[PDB]
Amino acid sequence: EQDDDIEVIVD
């Protein structure tokens, strides 16, 4: 995906 170099933390 385009911007999947960052891990987005959720709960």
Place this chain on the structure above:
Amino acid sequence: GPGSMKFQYKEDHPFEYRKKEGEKIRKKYPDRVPVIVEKAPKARVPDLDKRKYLVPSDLTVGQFYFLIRKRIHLRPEDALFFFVNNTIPPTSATMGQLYEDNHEEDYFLYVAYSDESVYGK
């Protein structure tokens, strides 16, 4: 910035690149903070698959710590410590407060982890 840490994200990118990435993330998500998480030099632990994290500002340091332990597949018996600007942060602080007090000129908060309680040992 302050401290005497060494992060590969900074080895790999010049300041102008980092600042553009950090600024962009800060703008797009006002209630989250961008964080670089890397293993400390000499630490006998795995690396993370990704080193950039977008973290809710009200998530506590303690909760973030448990998430990183899980990402590198630590056993309950295994030690792990965070370091931010050469200090182990308190677990009750929010990531947003830790970010405010420690983020660098490129708008990233830098967190190192190690199995030892002294950075670089």
